Structures are given as structure tokens and as C-alpha cells.
Design a protein around this ligand. Structure first.
Ligand SMILES: *[C@@H]1O[C@H](CO)[C@@H](O)[C@H](O)[C@H]1NC(C)=O
Lengths: 99, 276, 9
């Protein structure tokens, strides 16, 4: 089977310019497990990004949580970029703090 | 509320390397407490929860030893599955297993669980009677018979009803302070235009534990089902979770919609609207 | 406490 990944970009705590927070990207519902995930700052891949270890849910689909420590600013735009066999091309999702 | 232990095991075959990658992860009340990765430099179960630190060397050797045994089982099964489905070599395949036991608030057994999946689809699962099986498809039929003939079920039912429950009791007693806590939801509503004369309201729930929660939108007493989107509960990163429910409302008549948040950590359900 | 599997698939 092949299940396209579900992606959510969000900050651990509600964002606050100048206040240290955490930027998460929860990639879930996918299968097989081979998946590529990056967090972007102004369109560039962030180097120091950690993630949880592979896991799966009841429906057998896999899920990971990618995260980085960061300080939100008004103009800095964040995003998550996901690649997976089910995607014809990298799927980018922009962070929307006021969602 | 109820409790449970689970072991989520995955094996992924891969071209060239005759050894599949194996990852086992155990949970208690849905919290990861131990973990084994065959790709690590020195394969061995590792405590993933703080209350697992008190377990001595004998404990980890026994656990790691089983993981090593599991690798071989998965290595072999993957091989057989590749034959049951007449698939060709030089590829990558996934075999998964879920095991565990559910306990009621009284710490007594509710359910025994044991099922497998191949390529992400149900293959064979032990029925709730812990005596018979369900083979999701033709190939699994071959496996149901082999196991009915061997009487495997009796072995698992033994583990599920005995060792599973006993050890789950302990982990609950040891991780008491952490596992049995409850963090109530913190709610608020957001507003966003959607279309002409349309509006999107979003009921947010942040910082709660456990992850189970219910979010509803309603128009003057009736509950809403249409144009109502419920996003997937997600981890915050600090051990609490978040979720939200959105509903499309006709511009202007927004205060007429209200949402409620239900969670076991809440004396009474939260009730809120979009307050401008 | 993990389980250990008996007969291969
Ligand atoms: C655990 O599984 C192995 C094979 O995976 C089996 O040989 C062993 O008997 C099982 N443990 C027990 C106590 O039966």
C-alpha cells in the first residue's frame, strides 16, 4: 500500500515575536516509512533539526515529529518540506501562526 | 479510565542487505517507554521513559534478547510473505505487529491484542477470544492454518493474559507520577473569512494529556456535522497535545455558534464562542 | 515486557 503523508506545521506554544518557541512539523499517515522532511526558514533548509523516532498508529501508517527551537519574528516565514514516494514532487506547507 | 501496554514492531526488508531493519517500540497508556533499533551501533532496548531507569541489567538483557529473537522471526516471515505473494527480490517490504493488553480502571484485563500487517495492510490478527484468527486475505489463509495446526494462539493468549498484564501493572506502579496525570485543554476560537458571506471559526485545544479529546461545534443547541473539519490530534512536543475543529459560518451570525471541549481532565466541558 | 513470536508467518 502507499499512503500519502499528512503534514502539519505549527509552533509548540502560541507564537510570540521575540519569545523563544519550538517549530514543529508533524508528518503522519504515511506508508511505506521512507520519508524525507525538512524545516525551512525563509525558504532555506534548517541544519539543526531533530525529530522523534519512527512510529506508527492503529491503521499501520507511520508518523514522525520534526522540530527545532526558534524565535518567531514578524517577517521570518517558516515552512516544512516533505518528499515521499506518494508525492510526484516535494510538498511544501507554510507555517501559519494565526491559524 | 482504562490502561494498556503495546509493542509496535516493524521490519523493513531492503535490497542487497540480507538483514532487514527492525524497530520495536513499547508503550504504556500510549506513552513510549522502551525502544529497540537494529541499526543502532549497539542494538538493545533503551529506556524511553524516566521510570524505566530503575530496571537493572538483567531486565534489559532479557528484553534485548527477545528483540534479537524477533528480528529473525521477522526476517523469516518477510521471506515467506515474499513467496506467498509471488513477489520478486531486489525490493523493499514492510511487516508490522501490534501486541498488548487493555486494562480497565480496575487494572483488570479487558482485551488481548495481537495482529500483523504486510505492506501496510492487515494480514492476520488474533481474534478477541484469543483462541482463533482472522486472515485478511488468501495468503493469510495459509498462515491461519499453519497456526491453527501449531496452536500458536495458546502461547500468545498466555502472554497477553499473564505476563502482559503483570508487567503492565508494574509499569503503572513505577510511572505513577507521570503516567496517571491529566492536563486539561486550554481553548480559544479563531476567525477567518472563507468565501462571500462565509466565515471559518476554529475551536482550538492546547496543552492537554491524555490525547483523547472531543471537540464539537453547535448552532443553538444542535450539533453540527456538515462543513465541519476536525484536524488530526498532534503532539505539541512537551508531552501534551493539540487539536482543533473548524466550521463554516454565514458572515455576521457568528456568535450563534458555540463549541465544547471534552476531556477527562475537565470537571465540566469548556464552552466558548468567537469573542471579537 | 515484550512478547516473543512462535511460528513464522
Ligand atoms: C519467544 O519466541 C521465540 C522465537 O521467536 C521462541 O523460541 C520462545 O519459545 C518464545 N518464548 C517463550 C517463553 O516461549
Amino acid at each position: 500500500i502507499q499512503r500519502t503523508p499528512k503534514i502539519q506545521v505549527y509552533s509548540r506554544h502560541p507564537a510570540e515575536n521575540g519569545k523563544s518557541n519550538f517549530l514543529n512539523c508533524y508528518v503522519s499517515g504515511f506508508h511505506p516509512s521512507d520519508i524525507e522532511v525538512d524545516l525551512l526558514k525563509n525558504g532555506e533548509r534548517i541544519e539543526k533539526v531533530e525529530h522523534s523516532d519512527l512510529s506508527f498508529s492503529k491503521d499501520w501508517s507511520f508518523y514522525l515529529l520534526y522540530y527545532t527551537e526558534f524565535t518567531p519574528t514578524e517577517k521570518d516565514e517558516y515552512a516544512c518540506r516533505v518528499n515521499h514516494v506518494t508525492l510526484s514532487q516535494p510538498k511544501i506547507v507554510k507555517w501559519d501562526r494565526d491559524m | 479510565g482504562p490502561h494498556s501496554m503495546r509493542y509496535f514492531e516493524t521490519a523493513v526488508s531492503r535490497p542487497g542487505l540480507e538483514e532487514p531493519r527492525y524497530i520495536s517500540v513499547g508503550y504504556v497508556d500510549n506513552k513510549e517507554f522502551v525502544r529497540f533499533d537494529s541499526d543502532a551501533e549497539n542494538p538493545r532496548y533503551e529506556p524511553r521513559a524516566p521510570w524505566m531507569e530503575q530496571e537493572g541489567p538483567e531486565y534489559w538483557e532479557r528484553e534485548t534478547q527477545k528483540a534479537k529473537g524477533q528480528e529473525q522471526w521477522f526476517r523469516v516471515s518477510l521471506r515467506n510473505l515474499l513467496g506467498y505473494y509471488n513477489q520478486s527480490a531486489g525490493g523493499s517490504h514492510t511487516l508490522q505487529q501490534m501486541s498488548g493488553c487493555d486494562l480497565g480502571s480496575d487494572w483488570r484485563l479487558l482485551r488481548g491484542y495481537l495482529q500483523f500487517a504486510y505492506e501496510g495492510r492487515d494480514y492476520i490478527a488474533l481474534n478477541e477470544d484469543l483462541k482463533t484468527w482472522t486472515a485478511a486475505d488468501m495468503a493469510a489463509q495459509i498462515t491461519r492454518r499453519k497456526w491453527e495446526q501449531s496452536g500458536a494462539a495458546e502461547h500468545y493468549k498466555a502472554y497477553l493474559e499473564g505476563e502482559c498484564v503483570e508487567w503492565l501493572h508494574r509499569y503503572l506502579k513505577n510511572g505513577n507520577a507521570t503516567l496517571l496525570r491529566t492536563d486539561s485543554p486550554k481553548a480559544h476560537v479563531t476567525h477567518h473569512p472563507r468565501s462571500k458571506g462565509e466565515v471559518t471559526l476554529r475551536c482550538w485545544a492546547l496543552g492537554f494529556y491524555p490525547a483523547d479529546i472531543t471537540l464539537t461545534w453547535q448552532l443553538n443547541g444542535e450539533e453540527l456535522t456538515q462543513d465541519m473539519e476536525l484536524v488530526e490530534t498532534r503532539p505539541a512536543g512537551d508531552g501534551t497535545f493539540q487539536k482543533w475543529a473548524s466550521v463554516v459560518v454565514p458572515l455576521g451570525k457568528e456568535q450563534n455558534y458555540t463549541c465544547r471541549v471534552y476531556h477527562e481532565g475537565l470537571p465540566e466541558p469548556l464552552t466558548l464562542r468567537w469573542e471579537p | 515486557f515484550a512478547p516473543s513470536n512462535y511460528p513464522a508467518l
